[PDB]
Nucleic acid binder design. Structure first.
Lengths: 414, 71, 71, 414
DNA sequence: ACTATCCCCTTAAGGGGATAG
DNA sequence: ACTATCCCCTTAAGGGGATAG
């Protein structure tokens, strides 16, 4: 049974799984002519026939969680006919990342467009703690996370094809929730485009609540709209199995070249490189392709989305085996001897060497390093004097401590 | 209309128009004096494509282009 | 706006915009990662110019393009 | 004193002749922003500074007659300070070909926009016969010709910057007027885009009156508008001294490539080639660059204008030295051995060989030859049964006779 | 100050011609 | 039927680097 692909209650097309198990997709003629017309994914450009390339399979596969174990948790819950992307998506296809809503062909079953259940502080504590040992969502990423709808002053669960407004993350790293909450506050303090996140406390459980940037209420405030988007694995039609550059995923050059075609190209390119430096300063090593996204706009235009899923690997050193010399950036920089990626061995000359080959304005690479050189100090303070009274000072200190260590490498030159 | 910012967004668009009009790479290529391979390259690898090529194909599609601000 | 049908009409237009905005081939080329010679070639010999080149220069001019019918 | 360049009462810019005698031109900022904005000539693209290249000189020089002897006739009449383009244009700069109106900087002298003097059958006979042994016009071309304004049922002479509606040609070839009047009627009969011309009879003189296609009355019928245009010498910034291809002018390839950038590219290219065949059939050998023009449209767009200045060299054979084997097309075709141009040696295989290199649809070259193959016969008849009662049957017969001779070469294959 | 050239060098467009899927 | 490749071959884009007007 074909899966009708909707995008904000607009028929875009259908997903078909043939007998031979070949996934195919076909744009709806009405969509090809729509005002809102745009490809589901840049890897699937609007055209007339049945699209049969692997990009079709990879695109939809990238909407589901990475872990083959987690998928089992899904086949278990909503009794799926297989761990196959198509079968799974036929169960939780409603609130998937980005803005697609996959609903079986045989299933108009008009679902409530705007419906939710105001959870109690207990039910919340139940749902949060739940993900460890109507709710048809789908959050893709590296770790275990769900998604809720925030309205008024209550955390409510969507009912039907109703959208969510927050991506909620649970503690895995011993305090991944606190690690990310910090990295995000710091990111904002430094002018990087990131989502405002908060920490929700339900009884004993402690969870992270990130505001979604792929969700927006219409002017009337009567409808919550999903904004189309896709990560860099999708954009390039690649399988999440290659999200890291070392495995075969896209790197700086690939991404940077692609960003040249952005509606906000010059700004996005600047912002992308700037972030390569930030990831270095806070020892973030999760900067893989599925962690960068572009918004898809009417006609096929796209621009970089805010950065997300940021965590520092600093809190995981010393006491254990892990050492600063064992931290490597997911995307390499240009070095004299091939390429570099070891945080503790990385120096400004590396970002400048990268900029040289990519031909990214040298002067802008200098200004990026310069801005950080003189802003980190003040940044840490404001962030710190923001951390809630009950924030693990070992997280603050581990991050703050190592940032200054690397920062010094900057101020020493800028 | 929709603003375009890259060779690829361009080719996707132009290829859509050719398909929506029922034309093949052959009939268009004959009309404008270029090889069918050229049209094929343009549709799949527009980055290193010549501008005359681009305009000849634009003419064969009974289309034209215009500049504008990116807002 | 005005419909364009050739590489030359294009370059003339784009070059006008650069001049009206007071920019030089150098400042634009640095911003988009290409050589100043490339911009110069584009302005005088647009026929055999690459599309990425064309779009990089289009971005440096804070412009965009759009398709349309030639009536 | 600078020459202010106007185009339908709109300041486009100024022509300057420096001390060193260097001609320069500068677009008026107001024009660069105008709705009607477009270059004066494709060889002079809109830009900010002073244009100093030779295209400036060549462009304006191409508005004046070719013959250095005729220019003297101008320096004589309107007492010019020189045969120099600038000085001459400062005298008869008003109604020049195309649509430019050159008026001295120091000379607002608002001239009547719509004014004319209804000539008598005698005054007409005076003006016609005049060109052999307010009236500030300028007709460029190969032969001696003037220009009049036709209104109601009287031939009137413009007064001021008032435009003309007809290009009047006088007998030189013994009956050039009749030769062209025929070639044009025939051209139309075969579907070629040409101007409707008529023969005006004033006393003893016999003149040709071609309707101008670069003139159009506004909707209100209150203003006669000049449509911007330029010939192929101008378009390429070349001096009229190279109007013929053998001298250095543009040929088929040059023109055909340029026509690819037309708003009506595919149709113009077809029409241009078609005409290369027509010129062959009627033994026309004046097809030089200054005989083809493009209309300049807002923004820099252009499209081919109707064909004009068509004359058959057939009436000039036998009785004199001239022979069919001595007729050569101004623009050569591709041959096995280099290039061919001898009318009497030209065959369909030549146009097809040319089309092959230019990559002009072979099928369209076949259809062109085919259409002529079966249309000439009927064409000659309708034209013939149109020739006024007093039309030199030696012209008709000489042309008609040789057309069939070449035509046979076609019907024999198509 | 700004733009057009120029040498060196690698990569490849696009026309010819033509075929595998 | 239609599109993607493929070999051969000449021409040149565009990056490096850098200078004449």
């Amino acid at each position: 049974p074909k899966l009708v692909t909707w995008m904000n209650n607009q028929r875009v097309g259908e997903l078909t799984k043939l007998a031979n198990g070949a996934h195919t997709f076909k744009y709806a003629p009405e969509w090809l002519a729509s005002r809102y017309a745009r490809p589901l994914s840049l890897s699937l450009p609007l055209q007339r026939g049945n699209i049969t390339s692997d990009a079709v399979f990879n695109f939809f596969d990238n909407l589901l969680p990475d872990s083959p174990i987690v998928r089992d948790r899904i086949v278990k819950r909503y009794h799926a006919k297989s761990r196959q992307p198509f079968d799974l998506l036929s169960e939780i296809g409603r609130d998937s990342v980005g803005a697609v809503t996959l609903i079986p062909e045989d299933e108009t079953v008009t679902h409530p467009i705007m419906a939710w259940e105001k959870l109690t502080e207990a039910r919340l504590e139940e749902v949060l703690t739940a993900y460890k040992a109507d709710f048809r969502i789908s959050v893709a990423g590296a770790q275990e996370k769900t998604a809720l709808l925030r309205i008024g002053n209550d955390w409510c669960i969507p009912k039907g094809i109703t959208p969510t407004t927050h991506i909620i993350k649970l503690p895995i790293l011993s305090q991944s929730v606190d690690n990310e909450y910090y990295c995000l506050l710091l990111a904002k303090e430094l002018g990087l485009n990131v989502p405002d996140a908060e920490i929700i406390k339900a009884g004993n459980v402690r969870a992270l609540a990130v505001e979604r940037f792929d969700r927006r209420w219409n002017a009337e405030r009567t409808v919550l709209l999903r904004l189309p988007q896709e990560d860099m694995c999708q954009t390039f039609g690649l399988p999440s199995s290659v999200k890291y550059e070392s495995d075969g995923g896209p790197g700086i050059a690939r991404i940077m070249a692609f960003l040249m075609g952005s509606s906000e190209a010059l700004k996005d390119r600047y912002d992308f490189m700037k972030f390569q430096v930030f990831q270095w300063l806070i020892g973030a090593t999760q900067g893989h392709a599925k962690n960068f996204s572009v918004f898809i706009q009417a006609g096929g235009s796209y621009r970089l989305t805010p950065f997300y899923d940021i965590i520092s690997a600093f809190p995981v050193l010393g006491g254990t085996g892990i050492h600063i010399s064992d931290l490597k950036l997911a995307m390499g920089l240009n070095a004299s001897k091939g390429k570099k990626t070891a945080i503790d061995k990385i120096y400004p000359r590396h970002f400048l060497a990268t900029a040289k080959v990519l031909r990214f304005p040298e002067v802008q690479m200098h200004e990026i390093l310069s801005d950080f050189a003189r802003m980190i100090p003040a940044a840490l303070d404001n962030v710190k004097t923001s951390l809630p009274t009950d924030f693990p000072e070992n997280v603050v200190t581990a991050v703050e401590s190592n940032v200054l260590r690397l920062h010094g490498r900057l101020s020493r030159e800028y | 209309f929709q603003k375009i910012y890259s060779p690829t967004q361009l080719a996707n668009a132009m290829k859509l128009v050719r398909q929506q009009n029922g034309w093949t790479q052959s009939e268009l290529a004959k009309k404008i004096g270029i090889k069918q391979a050229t049209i094929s390259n343009f549709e799949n690898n527009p980055d290193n494509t010549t501008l005359t090529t681009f305009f000849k194909i634009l003419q064969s599609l009974e289309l034209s282009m215009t500049l504008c601000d990116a807002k």
